[PDB]
Amino acid sequence: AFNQTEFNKLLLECVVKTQSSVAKILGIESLSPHVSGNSKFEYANMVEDIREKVSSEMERFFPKNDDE
Amino acid sequence: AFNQTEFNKLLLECVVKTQSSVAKILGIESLSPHVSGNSKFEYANMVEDIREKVSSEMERFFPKNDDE
Amino acid sequence: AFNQTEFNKLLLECVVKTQSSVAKILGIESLSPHVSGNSKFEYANMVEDIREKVSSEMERFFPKNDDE
Amino acid sequence: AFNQTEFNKLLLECVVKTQSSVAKILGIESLSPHVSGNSKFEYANMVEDIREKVSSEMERFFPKNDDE
């Protein structure tokens, strides 16, 4: 008897907790002295790149237009 | 013949292992000298912020009250 | 028409890639000078703790005994 | 009334955002001075190892040959 609900609860807790934690690790890493002056790892540049990636995948699976 | 059970096993192993690993990486990063004195990255502050985020998403999908 | 197969493919690629990457980040972070001599972040200690966590969750959902 | 669609949306946003963020954290960590000259953590070596892992799991669940 596979408990899909409990599996979903664990899955969600893990992925939400991981994303919230990784967002902080990304900010801390952006402040590291060995990437100062490296445009690729400037925090605003990273956030924009991540935003574009997430938005494009979301648009593939959950398009704003439900009748393309 | 898609093996949903084996897919679920891989998914769970990955997300649980990742979350357990990320929790440790977060602790190590909190101790980094370049974020000393930065309240945003103080470990207790980060943990509270993460806790609030996880709790709010869990309450959206798995509310304590099953008859709202 | 929700493409569950393509969604599953993206989900798996992401979680497997993330776990493989996080395993390396964990190793690099274990070598950081600010956690030298901190038993909590000694690599073998971290790996054992992670292993116990993953094993216990896997045993909850996919027990070795299929007739408890 | 469990909203599978909204759950899927949150799951996808989290895993895609996490993977995009972790890919950047991996690059920053590869540049860390304490792993200079350590072949295990050379960036190209890490990327190849990750690629092999992702490819093998993808081939297990979504084989290029649909009639083995």
PDB file of C-alpha atoms in Angstrom:
ATOM      1  CA  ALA A   1       0.000   0.000   0.000  1.00  0.00           C
ATOM      2  CA  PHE A   2       2.053   2.928  -1.346  1.00  0.00           C
ATOM      3  CA  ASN A   3       1.234   6.162   0.450  1.00  0.00           C
ATOM      4  CA  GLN A   4       1.373   8.672  -2.398  1.00  0.00           C
ATOM      5  CA  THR A   5       0.271  11.526  -0.109  1.00  0.00           C
ATOM      6  CA  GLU A   6       3.093  10.960   2.385  1.00  0.00           C
ATOM      7  CA  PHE A   7       5.562  10.528  -0.498  1.00  0.00           C
ATOM      8  CA  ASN A   8       4.379  13.867  -1.953  1.00  0.00           C
ATOM      9  CA  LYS A   9       4.790  15.524   1.458  1.00  0.00           C
ATOM     10  CA  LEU A  10       8.391  14.331   1.771  1.00  0.00           C
ATOM     11  CA  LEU A  11       9.158  15.299  -1.840  1.00  0.00           C
ATOM     12  CA  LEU A  12       7.773  18.802  -1.364  1.00  0.00           C
ATOM     13  CA  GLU A  13       9.494  19.394   1.977  1.00  0.00           C
ATOM     14  CA  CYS A  14      12.816  18.325   0.486  1.00  0.00           C
ATOM     15  CA  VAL A  15      12.639  20.363  -2.736  1.00  0.00           C
ATOM     16  CA  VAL A  16      11.298  23.530  -1.065  1.00  0.00           C
ATOM     17  CA  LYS A  17      13.855  23.299   1.761  1.00  0.00           C
ATOM     18  CA  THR A  18      16.656  22.653  -0.731  1.00  0.00           C
ATOM     19  CA  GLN A  19      15.706  25.551  -2.972  1.00  0.00           C
ATOM     20  CA  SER A  20      15.424  27.983  -0.023  1.00  0.00           C
ATOM     21  CA  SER A  21      18.840  26.808   1.244  1.00  0.00           C
ATOM     22  CA  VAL A  22      20.497  26.909  -2.180  1.00  0.00           C
ATOM     23  CA  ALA A  23      19.245  30.465  -2.720  1.00  0.00           C
ATOM     24  CA  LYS A  24      21.204  31.471   0.397  1.00  0.00           C
ATOM     25  CA  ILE A  25      24.290  29.462  -0.532  1.00  0.00           C
ATOM     26  CA  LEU A  26      24.240  31.214  -3.955  1.00  0.00           C
ATOM     27  CA  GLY A  27      24.215  34.612  -2.251  1.00  0.00           C
ATOM     28  CA  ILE A  28      27.077  33.665   0.084  1.00  0.00           C
ATOM     29  CA  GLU A  29      29.129  32.256  -2.813  1.00  0.00           C
ATOM     30  CA  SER A  30      28.593  35.437  -4.855  1.00  0.00           C
ATOM     31  CA  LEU A  31      30.413  37.319  -2.051  1.00  0.00           C
ATOM     32  CA  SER A  32      33.446  35.009  -2.194  1.00  0.00           C
ATOM     33  CA  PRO A  33      36.694  36.908  -2.844  1.00  0.00           C
ATOM     34  CA  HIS A  34      37.864  34.528  -5.618  1.00  0.00           C
ATOM     35  CA  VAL A  35      34.951  35.527  -7.855  1.00  0.00           C
ATOM     36  CA  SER A  36      35.125  39.315  -7.271  1.00  0.00           C
ATOM     37  CA  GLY A  37      35.259  41.046 -10.670  1.00  0.00           C
ATOM     38  CA  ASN A  38      34.107  37.922 -12.493  1.00  0.00           C
ATOM     39  CA  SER A  39      30.994  39.071 -14.347  1.00  0.00           C
ATOM     40  CA  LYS A  40      29.739  35.474 -14.768  1.00  0.00           C
ATOM     41  CA  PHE A  41      29.272  35.196 -10.998  1.00  0.00           C
ATOM     42  CA  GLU A  42      28.030  38.694 -10.212  1.00  0.00           C
ATOM     43  CA  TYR A  43      24.870  38.136  -8.190  1.00  0.00           C
ATOM     44  CA  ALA A  44      22.425  40.143 -10.339  1.00  0.00           C
ATOM     45  CA  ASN A  45      23.790  38.433 -13.478  1.00  0.00           C
ATOM     46  CA  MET A  46      23.333  35.000 -11.917  1.00  0.00           C
ATOM     47  CA  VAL A  47      19.773  35.790 -10.756  1.00  0.00           C
ATOM     48  CA  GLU A  48      18.776  36.975 -14.234  1.00  0.00           C
ATOM     49  CA  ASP A  49      20.207  33.858 -15.870  1.00  0.00           C
ATOM     50  CA  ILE A  50      18.398  31.623 -13.376  1.00  0.00           C
ATOM     51  CA  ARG A  51      15.158  33.572 -13.826  1.00  0.00           C
ATOM     52  CA  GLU A  52      15.295  33.116 -17.635  1.00  0.00           C
ATOM     53  CA  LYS A  53      15.909  29.375 -17.284  1.00  0.00           C
ATOM     54  CA  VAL A  54      13.063  28.827 -14.803  1.00  0.00           C
ATOM     55  CA  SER A  55      10.660  30.987 -16.848  1.00  0.00           C
ATOM     56  CA  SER A  56      11.399  29.100 -20.078  1.00  0.00           C
ATOM     57  CA  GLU A  57      10.861  25.658 -18.546  1.00  0.00           C
ATOM     58  CA  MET A  58       7.675  26.831 -16.818  1.00  0.00           C
ATOM     59  CA  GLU A  59       6.370  28.192 -20.111  1.00  0.00           C
ATOM     60  CA  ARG A  60       7.046  24.836 -21.783  1.00  0.00           C
ATOM     61  CA  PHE A  61       4.948  22.866 -19.294  1.00  0.00           C
ATOM     62  CA  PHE A  62       2.513  25.474 -17.934  1.00  0.00           C
ATOM     63  CA  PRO A  63       2.046  28.039 -20.712  1.00  0.00           C
ATOM     64  CA  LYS A  64       0.265  31.289 -19.930  1.00  0.00           C
ATOM     65  CA  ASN A  65      -1.833  30.564 -23.054  1.00  0.00           C
ATOM     66  CA  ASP A  66      -4.014  27.462 -22.476  1.00  0.00           C
ATOM     67  CA  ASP A  67      -5.177  27.320 -26.129  1.00  0.00           C
ATOM     68  CA  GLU A  68      -2.110  27.534 -28.402  1.00  0.00           C
TER      69      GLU A  68
ATOM     70  CA  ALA B   1       6.659  -0.327 -19.620  1.00  0.00           C
ATOM     71  CA  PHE B   2       7.499   2.656 -17.386  1.00  0.00           C
ATOM     72  CA  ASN B   3       8.575   1.560 -13.923  1.00  0.00           C
ATOM     73  CA  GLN B   4       6.968   4.226 -11.745  1.00  0.00           C
ATOM     74  CA  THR B   5       8.148   2.506  -8.543  1.00  0.00           C
ATOM     75  CA  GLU B   6      11.812   2.514  -9.582  1.00  0.00           C
ATOM     76  CA  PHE B   7      11.460   6.112 -10.816  1.00  0.00           C
ATOM     77  CA  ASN B   8      10.007   7.091  -7.411  1.00  0.00           C
ATOM     78  CA  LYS B   9      12.893   5.327  -5.647  1.00  0.00           C
ATOM     79  CA  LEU B  10      15.493   7.258  -7.647  1.00  0.00           C
ATOM     80  CA  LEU B  11      13.604  10.541  -7.172  1.00  0.00           C
ATOM     81  CA  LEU B  12      13.387  10.056  -3.412  1.00  0.00           C
ATOM     82  CA  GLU B  13      17.014   8.985  -3.000  1.00  0.00           C
ATOM     83  CA  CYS B  14      18.164  12.031  -4.950  1.00  0.00           C
ATOM     84  CA  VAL B  15      16.016  14.643  -3.181  1.00  0.00           C
ATOM     85  CA  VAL B  16      16.631  13.269   0.333  1.00  0.00           C
ATOM     86  CA  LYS B  17      20.383  12.939  -0.292  1.00  0.00           C
ATOM     87  CA  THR B  18      20.514  16.436  -1.783  1.00  0.00           C
ATOM     88  CA  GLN B  19      18.618  18.028   1.078  1.00  0.00           C
ATOM     89  CA  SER B  20      20.786  16.299   3.724  1.00  0.00           C
ATOM     90  CA  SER B  21      23.930  17.436   1.860  1.00  0.00           C
ATOM     91  CA  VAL B  22      22.693  20.990   1.295  1.00  0.00           C
ATOM     92  CA  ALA B  23      21.860  21.325   4.997  1.00  0.00           C
ATOM     93  CA  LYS B  24      25.545  20.664   5.735  1.00  0.00           C
ATOM     94  CA  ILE B  25      26.814  22.944   2.976  1.00  0.00           C
ATOM     95  CA  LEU B  26      24.579  25.719   4.421  1.00  0.00           C
ATOM     96  CA  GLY B  27      26.166  25.258   7.844  1.00  0.00           C
ATOM     97  CA  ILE B  28      29.700  25.320   6.415  1.00  0.00           C
ATOM     98  CA  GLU B  29      28.931  28.429   4.336  1.00  0.00           C
ATOM     99  CA  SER B  30      27.498  30.222   7.387  1.00  0.00           C
ATOM    100  CA  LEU B  31      30.971  29.884   8.981  1.00  0.00           C
ATOM    101  CA  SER B  32      32.719  31.506   6.004  1.00  0.00           C
ATOM    102  CA  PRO B  33      34.763  34.571   7.007  1.00  0.00           C
ATOM    103  CA  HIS B  34      33.347  36.785   4.210  1.00  0.00           C
ATOM    104  CA  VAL B  35      29.851  36.632   5.710  1.00  0.00           C
ATOM    105  CA  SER B  36      30.836  37.183   9.376  1.00  0.00           C
ATOM    106  CA  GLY B  37      28.745  40.060  10.760  1.00  0.00           C
ATOM    107  CA  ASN B  38      26.282  39.876   7.876  1.00  0.00           C
ATOM    108  CA  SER B  39      22.935  39.352   9.598  1.00  0.00           C
ATOM    109  CA  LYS B  40      21.329  38.003   6.390  1.00  0.00           C
ATOM    110  CA  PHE B  41      23.622  34.964   6.521  1.00  0.00           C
ATOM    111  CA  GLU B  42      23.723  34.356  10.265  1.00  0.00           C
ATOM    112  CA  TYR B  43      22.866  30.681  10.642  1.00  0.00           C
ATOM    113  CA  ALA B  44      19.881  31.005  13.010  1.00  0.00           C
ATOM    114  CA  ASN B  45      18.423  33.757  10.788  1.00  0.00           C
ATOM    115  CA  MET B  46      18.792  31.580   7.695  1.00  0.00           C
ATOM    116  CA  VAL B  47      17.211  28.545   9.409  1.00  0.00           C
ATOM    117  CA  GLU B  48      14.206  30.597  10.530  1.00  0.00           C
ATOM    118  CA  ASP B  49      13.685  32.018   7.044  1.00  0.00           C
ATOM    119  CA  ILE B  50      13.906  28.542   5.509  1.00  0.00           C
ATOM    120  CA  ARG B  51      11.553  27.119   8.143  1.00  0.00           C
ATOM    121  CA  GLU B  52       8.914  29.799   7.378  1.00  0.00           C
ATOM    122  CA  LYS B  53       9.145  29.128   3.638  1.00  0.00           C
ATOM    123  CA  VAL B  54       8.832  25.342   3.984  1.00  0.00           C
ATOM    124  CA  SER B  55       5.968  25.655   6.497  1.00  0.00           C
ATOM    125  CA  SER B  56       3.987  28.012   4.247  1.00  0.00           C
ATOM    126  CA  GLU B  57       4.277  25.799   1.165  1.00  0.00           C
ATOM    127  CA  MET B  58       3.402  22.700   3.201  1.00  0.00           C
ATOM    128  CA  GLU B  59       0.333  24.455   4.581  1.00  0.00           C
ATOM    129  CA  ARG B  60      -0.770  25.339   1.044  1.00  0.00           C
ATOM    130  CA  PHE B  61      -0.724  21.732  -0.165  1.00  0.00           C
ATOM    131  CA  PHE B  62      -1.161  19.719   3.049  1.00  0.00           C
ATOM    132  CA  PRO B  63      -3.137  21.940   5.432  1.00  0.00           C
ATOM    133  CA  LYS B  64      -3.446  20.917   9.065  1.00  0.00           C
ATOM    134  CA  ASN B  65      -7.200  21.553   8.632  1.00  0.00           C
ATOM    135  CA  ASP B  66      -8.692  18.987   6.202  1.00  0.00           C
ATOM    136  CA  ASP B  67     -12.094  20.755   6.067  1.00  0.00           C
ATOM    137  CA  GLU B  68     -11.519  24.468   5.360  1.00  0.00           C
TER     138      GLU B  68
ATOM    139  CA  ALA C   1      -2.523  17.931 -23.041  1.00  0.00           C
ATOM    140  CA  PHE C   2      -0.007  17.584 -20.187  1.00  0.00           C
ATOM    141  CA  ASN C   3       3.054  15.616 -21.244  1.00  0.00           C
ATOM    142  CA  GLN C   4       3.778  13.594 -18.110  1.00  0.00           C
ATOM    143  CA  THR C   5       6.653  11.740 -19.815  1.00  0.00           C
ATOM    144  CA  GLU C   6       8.489  14.936 -20.771  1.00  0.00           C
ATOM    145  CA  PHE C   7       7.804  16.376 -17.299  1.00  0.00           C
ATOM    146  CA  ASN C   8       9.299  13.213 -15.742  1.00  0.00           C
ATOM    147  CA  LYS C   9      12.351  13.512 -18.010  1.00  0.00           C
ATOM    148  CA  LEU C  10      12.995  17.102 -16.923  1.00  0.00           C
ATOM    149  CA  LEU C  11      12.398  16.231 -13.255  1.00  0.00           C
ATOM    150  CA  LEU C  12      14.834  13.321 -13.384  1.00  0.00           C
ATOM    151  CA  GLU C  13      17.537  15.227 -15.266  1.00  0.00           C
ATOM    152  CA  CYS C  14      17.333  18.057 -12.745  1.00  0.00           C
ATOM    153  CA  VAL C  15      17.385  15.948  -9.565  1.00  0.00           C
ATOM    154  CA  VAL C  16      20.125  13.572 -10.774  1.00  0.00           C
ATOM    155  CA  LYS C  17      22.274  16.460 -12.047  1.00  0.00           C
ATOM    156  CA  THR C  18      21.733  18.382  -8.809  1.00  0.00           C
ATOM    157  CA  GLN C  19      22.609  15.443  -6.593  1.00  0.00           C
ATOM    158  CA  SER C  20      25.783  14.644  -8.588  1.00  0.00           C
ATOM    159  CA  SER C  21      26.809  18.326  -8.390  1.00  0.00           C
ATOM    160  CA  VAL C  22      25.969  18.688  -4.695  1.00  0.00           C
ATOM    161  CA  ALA C  23      28.031  15.589  -3.888  1.00  0.00           C
ATOM    162  CA  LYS C  24      31.053  17.395  -5.361  1.00  0.00           C
ATOM    163  CA  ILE C  25      30.271  20.705  -3.672  1.00  0.00           C
ATOM    164  CA  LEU C  26      30.055  18.803  -0.337  1.00  0.00           C
ATOM    165  CA  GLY C  27      33.520  17.348  -0.906  1.00  0.00           C
ATOM    166  CA  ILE C  28      34.998  20.745  -1.808  1.00  0.00           C
ATOM    167  CA  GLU C  29      33.366  22.392   1.227  1.00  0.00           C
ATOM    168  CA  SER C  30      34.724  19.675   3.540  1.00  0.00           C
ATOM    169  CA  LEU C  31      38.238  20.806   2.496  1.00  0.00           C
ATOM    170  CA  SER C  32      37.560  24.445   3.416  1.00  0.00           C
ATOM    171  CA  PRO C  33      40.064  25.794   5.964  1.00  0.00           C
ATOM    172  CA  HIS C  34      37.368  27.313   8.234  1.00  0.00           C
ATOM    173  CA  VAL C  35      35.956  23.871   9.045  1.00  0.00           C
ATOM    174  CA  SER C  36      39.292  22.066   9.619  1.00  0.00           C
ATOM    175  CA  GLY C  37      39.145  20.327  13.013  1.00  0.00           C
ATOM    176  CA  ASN C  38      35.369  20.669  13.210  1.00  0.00           C
ATOM    177  CA  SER C  39      34.173  17.087  13.642  1.00  0.00           C
ATOM    178  CA  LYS C  40      30.630  17.974  12.480  1.00  0.00           C
ATOM    179  CA  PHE C  41      31.966  18.742   8.997  1.00  0.00           C
ATOM    180  CA  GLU C  42      34.599  16.029   8.670  1.00  0.00           C
ATOM    181  CA  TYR C  43      33.825  14.366   5.350  1.00  0.00           C
ATOM    182  CA  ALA C  44      33.440  10.761   6.565  1.00  0.00           C
ATOM    183  CA  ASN C  45      31.183  11.967   9.410  1.00  0.00           C
ATOM    184  CA  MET C  46      29.005  13.913   6.980  1.00  0.00           C
ATOM    185  CA  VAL C  47      28.741  10.962   4.556  1.00  0.00           C
ATOM    186  CA  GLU C  48      27.671   8.610   7.352  1.00  0.00           C
ATOM    187  CA  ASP C  49      25.023  11.040   8.587  1.00  0.00           C
ATOM    188  CA  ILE C  50      23.682  11.496   5.053  1.00  0.00           C
ATOM    189  CA  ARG C  51      23.718   7.738   4.446  1.00  0.00           C
ATOM    190  CA  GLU C  52      21.651   7.104   7.618  1.00  0.00           C
ATOM    191  CA  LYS C  53      19.101   9.751   6.628  1.00  0.00           C
ATOM    192  CA  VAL C  54      18.673   8.451   3.066  1.00  0.00           C
ATOM    193  CA  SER C  55      18.473   4.822   4.253  1.00  0.00           C
ATOM    194  CA  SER C  56      15.784   5.607   6.840  1.00  0.00           C
ATOM    195  CA  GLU C  57      13.554   7.485   4.394  1.00  0.00           C
ATOM    196  CA  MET C  58      14.003   4.767   1.763  1.00  0.00           C
ATOM    197  CA  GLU C  59      13.035   2.122   4.307  1.00  0.00           C
ATOM    198  CA  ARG C  60       9.878   4.078   5.159  1.00  0.00           C
ATOM    199  CA  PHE C  61       8.629   4.157   1.566  1.00  0.00           C
ATOM    200  CA  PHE C  62      10.345   1.143  -0.031  1.00  0.00           C
ATOM    201  CA  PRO C  63      10.903  -1.370   2.777  1.00  0.00           C
ATOM    202  CA  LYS C  64      13.121  -4.374   2.139  1.00  0.00           C
ATOM    203  CA  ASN C  65      10.263  -6.447   3.627  1.00  0.00           C
ATOM    204  CA  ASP C  66       7.202  -6.305   1.320  1.00  0.00           C
ATOM    205  CA  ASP C  67       4.935  -8.100   3.841  1.00  0.00           C
ATOM    206  CA  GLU C  68       5.284  -6.385   7.241  1.00  0.00           C
TER     207      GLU C  68
ATOM    208  CA  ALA D   1      -9.182  18.259  -3.421  1.00  0.00           C
ATOM    209  CA  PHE D   2      -5.453  17.856  -4.147  1.00  0.00           C
ATOM    210  CA  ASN D   3      -4.288  20.218  -6.871  1.00  0.00           C
ATOM    211  CA  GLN D   4      -1.817  18.039  -8.763  1.00  0.00           C
ATOM    212  CA  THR D   5      -1.224  20.760 -11.380  1.00  0.00           C
ATOM    213  CA  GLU D   6      -0.230  23.383  -8.805  1.00  0.00           C
ATOM    214  CA  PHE D   7       1.906  20.792  -6.982  1.00  0.00           C
ATOM    215  CA  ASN D   8       3.671  19.989 -10.284  1.00  0.00           C
ATOM    216  CA  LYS D   9       4.248  23.708 -10.905  1.00  0.00           C
ATOM    217  CA  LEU D  10       5.893  24.175  -7.504  1.00  0.00           C
ATOM    218  CA  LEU D  11       7.952  20.989  -7.923  1.00  0.00           C
ATOM    219  CA  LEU D  12       9.220  22.066 -11.336  1.00  0.00           C
ATOM    220  CA  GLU D  13      10.016  25.636 -10.289  1.00  0.00           C
ATOM    221  CA  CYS D  14      11.985  24.351  -7.309  1.00  0.00           C
ATOM    222  CA  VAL D  15      14.008  21.668  -9.120  1.00  0.00           C
ATOM    223  CA  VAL D  16      14.792  23.832 -12.172  1.00  0.00           C
ATOM    224  CA  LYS D  17      15.746  26.820  -9.994  1.00  0.00           C
ATOM    225  CA  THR D  18      17.875  24.599  -7.758  1.00  0.00           C
ATOM    226  CA  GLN D  19      19.698  22.965 -10.643  1.00  0.00           C
ATOM    227  CA  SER D  20      20.422  26.328 -12.335  1.00  0.00           C
ATOM    228  CA  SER D  21      21.719  27.699  -9.005  1.00  0.00           C
ATOM    229  CA  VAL D  22      23.774  24.606  -8.171  1.00  0.00           C
ATOM    230  CA  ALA D  23      25.417  24.729 -11.605  1.00  0.00           C
ATOM    231  CA  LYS D  24      26.711  28.202 -10.700  1.00  0.00           C
ATOM    232  CA  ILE D  25      27.748  27.224  -7.180  1.00  0.00           C
ATOM    233  CA  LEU D  26      29.716  24.298  -8.713  1.00  0.00           C
ATOM    234  CA  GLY D  27      31.569  26.702 -11.001  1.00  0.00           C
ATOM    235  CA  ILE D  28      32.374  29.091  -8.140  1.00  0.00           C
ATOM    236  CA  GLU D  29      33.564  26.219  -5.922  1.00  0.00           C
ATOM    237  CA  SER D  30      35.818  24.890  -8.702  1.00  0.00           C
ATOM    238  CA  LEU D  31      37.680  28.240  -8.536  1.00  0.00           C
ATOM    239  CA  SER D  32      38.287  27.948  -4.782  1.00  0.00           C
ATOM    240  CA  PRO D  33      41.995  28.131  -3.887  1.00  0.00           C
ATOM    241  CA  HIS D  34      41.886  25.056  -1.594  1.00  0.00           C
ATOM    242  CA  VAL D  35      41.057  22.766  -4.520  1.00  0.00           C
ATOM    243  CA  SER D  36      43.582  24.198  -7.028  1.00  0.00           C
ATOM    244  CA  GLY D  37      45.659  21.313  -8.416  1.00  0.00           C
ATOM    245  CA  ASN D  38      43.194  18.714  -7.159  1.00  0.00           C
ATOM    246  CA  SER D  39      42.233  16.806 -10.303  1.00  0.00           C
ATOM    247  CA  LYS D  40      39.040  15.445  -8.677  1.00  0.00           C
ATOM    248  CA  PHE D  41      37.616  18.974  -8.522  1.00  0.00           C
ATOM    249  CA  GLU D  42      38.906  20.367 -11.807  1.00  0.00           C
ATOM    250  CA  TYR D  43      35.829  21.822 -13.482  1.00  0.00           C
ATOM    251  CA  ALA D  44      35.984  19.899 -16.784  1.00  0.00           C
ATOM    252  CA  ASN D  45      36.549  16.643 -14.856  1.00  0.00           C
ATOM    253  CA  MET D  46      33.546  17.332 -12.633  1.00  0.00           C
ATOM    254  CA  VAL D  47      31.303  18.208 -15.608  1.00  0.00           C
ATOM    255  CA  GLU D  48      32.241  14.988 -17.412  1.00  0.00           C
ATOM    256  CA  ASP D  49      31.545  12.880 -14.328  1.00  0.00           C
ATOM    257  CA  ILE D  50      28.174  14.578 -13.832  1.00  0.00           C
ATOM    258  CA  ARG D  51      27.323  14.191 -17.523  1.00  0.00           C
ATOM    259  CA  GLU D  52      28.032  10.421 -17.395  1.00  0.00           C
ATOM    260  CA  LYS D  53      25.865   9.998 -14.293  1.00  0.00           C
ATOM    261  CA  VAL D  54      22.904  11.936 -15.720  1.00  0.00           C
ATOM    262  CA  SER D  55      23.165  10.154 -19.092  1.00  0.00           C
ATOM    263  CA  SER D  56      23.196   6.695 -17.486  1.00  0.00           C
ATOM    264  CA  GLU D  57      20.137   7.344 -15.317  1.00  0.00           C
ATOM    265  CA  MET D  58      18.276   8.898 -18.255  1.00  0.00           C
ATOM    266  CA  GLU D  59      19.072   5.860 -20.386  1.00  0.00           C
ATOM    267  CA  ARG D  60      17.695   3.574 -17.667  1.00  0.00           C
ATOM    268  CA  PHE D  61      14.301   5.291 -17.563  1.00  0.00           C
ATOM    269  CA  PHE D  62      14.019   6.898 -21.014  1.00  0.00           C
ATOM    270  CA  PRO D  63      16.086   4.729 -23.367  1.00  0.00           C
ATOM    271  CA  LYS D  64      16.832   5.998 -26.857  1.00  0.00           C
ATOM    272  CA  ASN D  65      15.630   2.564 -28.059  1.00  0.00           C
ATOM    273  CA  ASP D  66      11.879   2.170 -27.358  1.00  0.00           C
ATOM    274  CA  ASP D  67      11.852  -1.535 -28.355  1.00  0.00           C
ATOM    275  CA  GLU D  68      14.693  -3.319 -26.521  1.00  0.00           C
TER     276      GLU D  68
END
